[PDB]
Write a protein that binds this ligand. Structure first.
Ligand SMILES: Cc1cc2nc3c(=O)[nH]c(=O)nc-3n(C[C@H](O)[C@H](O)[C@H](O)COP(=O)(O)OP(=O)(O)OC[C@H]3O[C@@H](n4cnc5c(N)ncnc54)[C@H](O)[C@@H]3O)c2cc1C
Ligand SMILES: Cc1cc2nc3c(=O)[nH]c(=O)nc-3n(C[C@H](O)[C@H](O)[C@H](O)COP(=O)(O)OP(=O)(O)OC[C@H]3O[C@@H](n4cnc5c(N)ncnc54)[C@H](O)[C@@H]3O)c2cc1C
Lengths: 460, 460
């Protein structure tokens, strides 16, 4: 049995961050990976999806561009697009491999399973360490009545646009994955229908900005059906006849499509991992129970990322990996941070902090400030202003509580909001910062001014 | 004589901000404008230039897009482009006019001249007020040997691309104006040579990131010559023969172009304004002398924006207008803010805070963190991925001192840095904020980690 200071199972965002940070702190690390280095985000998630979205937005904007004299007869080669997507993925996963090697981390390819609290079995061989970090991630959640197959795709299959685009696609799930892939397919020419069980898409996010995103997608032809669920389907020669019903059940309604993309969630990869042999507690949902130090019920064993707890986001997994690594190295670290969320559709949607309802539930005297991109000079110079910024704060203390953005570059602008929350910023602090003009970032400053009823570019 | 609580001369960014904020505070305001409402930024500066840059970037990106299957046969109608530029300007200036009216601000069209400390003459009529706010802005600075005319353009003329593109253009000035218009013309097909008197472009900005921008421009075919000046020219049959020399004087070198764009600076519009009749002191350069409250040598008379002092930026003028208005309303406000600066070229350049040299002179123990966009996953998904983020801080206290960025969306990312500085953030604070992945904003977080020698995506 080979021994190390730390064994990390999984090399996705969380796992490779843990391995590298642990190595920087002087630990001898072994990283085990059953598939491609880089995990879901780099191979079949964040990266390939953002790549497709960029190509789709570039194509889409050309229609807007006709407005300023740019006439074009764009021809998109899907095979070439798929090739570029693959190249981007390869460059990034290769880069992580080079990073692991350069940091002295040993990389073992195989499926790891615990056989004890501090012993892992891989390919019949045993490996041990005083610390273990479980970063096994998640997988597409299956939906009753829609088993994955040739006609029912998961997000991974949906990425392969070069394998034939369906004329009609039904997307089940109004979360980031469904919205993003849905828009990609629409912009590539497919008829797209998206259904969401909740009253509004992005159910956990601010309903107002989420609604604006839905409206933008509807304007592009995507049929969005909220408070709706898909019960099952029947395969016929003319396509898949899917039965739709109201959220709480009711009168049936049929929709016929060629393919179905199921994006209703993720399932943590914690079964068949040997956790029951190590004493690691798992909750009813399959998530490994952890505290703020990312430590499990077993001393010296940590869990991070999608396998540990929602939200299922990459930057969160990355930070959790650093925390677990630092603690495995003997430090005293803990996760207590504001986690932003972004949807990379066009316009983008981003949020961080508390929604109006959550702030109210928390006991704050909620007050909001809004700034429409229709009043943004920068948005106009970019060919059109679609979106808004909403700031949530306490009117008594002036404390900033949350920020929600819908529009171009929302994902880049939300970092300013995250920093503001981490610094305990007030709405006055946000308004007092001199944002450059003209920029989309200015909308945050103006939304803060609107909160105080003194915005300049809009009547208060 | 008609009397008001406040008279604002000029309706550019500074002027209309002062007029509106004063109105919000209950003052009876009169705003005087000799030309188009909205000033330089909205009519012949920020807005039209950013619009042209966006069109040029959309066209340019098609080359990179070919890399992912996007085939196109672009055709740019310059007349249509100019028409769009005009539409954007008209919508925004019309918007400011609507805001002034909506706020109860009286708008008088004409050229105002003070005739006394608190009295202004317009069109032969007299107007008075307890407070006066001077926001007359600036105009293109003329260069010895290059009087403006048919062959020597100022930025306003350069905006009119629909009036014929020159085969060869010489741009004098390596500031934001020269760089931006130079890139617009190059992307539109012109041969472009740009010269800068100082050793590096963007002389007051971080030289490291400024040099990367220069190199990016040179890669696009723009010939950039620093430490160089233009002495004069002679109009011949084959074009304009311009004599160049080392900035400090020396052997001459001739360059032949069809048109020259002079972008060497601005001159404050303070002559013929009646300041000598009111007792308002002006410095050697023509700027109205003001303190942090934006107060001039005459109680009750304030000056803001380009007419008051450099840097000559829109967001600065806007904030100064708010300060002046608030003080005119009886409050106690003062300008003590970090002012970011942005160049909207591709890649963009942005900076805020202290450069390494300025921090060193300030007495800080300078330490820096750098992160290359070549290591950014998001940058790769957007195609080209060139640029870098540099953070400047104090080693002993960990205090963030300055941030400089060169790359896509640099101007949108700098607001986070500005907020950080206003909040007294340390490099640790910046690194601890969980930035969304994958985003370009992550580069700031990673540059902070690099400062501490523990960045994950690059070897330290
Ligand atoms: C289509 C799509 C788009 C997304 N877009 C975004 C986005 O834009 N932004 C964002 O923040 N998040 C996004 N996500 C979610 C993001 O991908 C995840 O939050 C992130 O990958 C979680 O990292 P992780 O390290 O926990 O796990 P994972 O990346 O899943 O990696 C776990 C790794 O462990 C390996 N592994 C598992 N079990 C074993 C075992 N027993 N032995 C050895 N190796 C094992 C796996 O093969 C894998 O490589 C997206 C997800 C999808 C599906
Ligand atoms: C090509 C170009 C691009 C630029 N790009 C940017 C950029 O991207 N970002 C940025 O921050 N800055 C940019 N600037 C600079 C920015 O435009 C100025 O900083 C800003 O306009 C200054 O605002 P202001 O209110 O002080 O003055 P101005 O906007 O100049 O407005 C002054 C107003 O006063 C009027 N006026 C003057 N004298 C009188 C009088 N006696 N009576 C009545 N009315 C009078 C003028 O007609 C005018 O409308 C750019 C400038 C140029 C030339």
């Amino acid at each position: 049995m080979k021994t190390y200071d730390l064994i990390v199972i999984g090399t996705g965002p969380g796992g490779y961050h843990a391995a590298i940070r642990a190595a920087q702190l002087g630990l001898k690390v072994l990283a085990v990976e059953a598939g491609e280095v880089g995990g879901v985000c780099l191979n079949v998630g964040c990266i390939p999806t953002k790549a497709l979205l960029h190509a789709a937005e570039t194509l889409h904007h050309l229609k807007v561009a006709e407005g300023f004299g740019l006439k074009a007869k764009p021809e998109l080669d899907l095979k070439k697009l798929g090739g570029w997507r693959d190249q981007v993925v390869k460059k990034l996963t290769g880069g992580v491999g080079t990073l692991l090697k350069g940091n002295g981390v040993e990389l073992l390819r195989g499926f790891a399973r615990l056989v004890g609290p501090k012993e892992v079995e891989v390919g019949g061989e045993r490996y041990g360490a005083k610390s273990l970090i479980l970063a096994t991630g998640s997988e597409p959640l299956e939906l009753k009545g829609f088993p994955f197959g040739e006609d029912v795709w998961d997000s991974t299959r949906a990425l392969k646009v070069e394998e034939g685009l369906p004329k009609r696609l039904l997307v089940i799930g109004g979360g980031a994955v469904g919205l993003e892939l849905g828009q990609v397919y629409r912009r590539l020419g497919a008829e797209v229908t998206l259904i969401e069980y909740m009253p509004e898409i992005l159910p956990q996010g601010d309903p107002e900005t989420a609604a604006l995103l839905r409206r933008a997608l509807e304007k592009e032809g995507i049929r969005v059906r909220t408070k709706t669920k898909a019960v099952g389907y029947e395969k016929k020669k003319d396509g898949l006849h899917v039965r739709l019903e109201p959220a709480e059940g009711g009168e049936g309604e049929e929709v016929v499509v060629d393919k179905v993309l199921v994006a209703v969630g993720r399932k943590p990869r914690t079964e068949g991992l040997g956790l029951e042999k190590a004493g690691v507690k798992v909750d009813e949902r399959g998530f490994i129970r952890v505290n703020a130090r990312m430590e499990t019920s077993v001393p010296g064993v940590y869990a991070i990322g999608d396998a540990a707890r929602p939200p299922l986001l990459a930057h969160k997994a990355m930070r959790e990996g650093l925390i677990a690594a630092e603690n495995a190295a003997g430090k005293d670290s803990a996760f207590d941070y504001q986690v932003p969320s972004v949807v990379y559709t066009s316009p983008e949607w981003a949020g961080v902090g508390l929604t109006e309802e959550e702030a109210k539930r928390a006991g704050y005297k909620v007050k909001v400030g809004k700034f429409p991109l229709a009043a943004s000079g920068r948005a106009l110079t970019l060919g059109g202003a679609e979106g808004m910024v909403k700031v949530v704060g306490d009117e008594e203390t002036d404390l900033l509580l949350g920020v929600f953005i819908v529009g171009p570059q929302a994902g880049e602008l939300i970092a300013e909001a995250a920093l503001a929350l981490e610094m305990g910023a007030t709405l006055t602090d946000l308004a007092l910062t001199v944002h450059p003009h003209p920029t989309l970032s200015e909308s945050l400053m103006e939304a803060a001014e609107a909160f105080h009823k003194q915005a300049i570019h809009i009547l208060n």
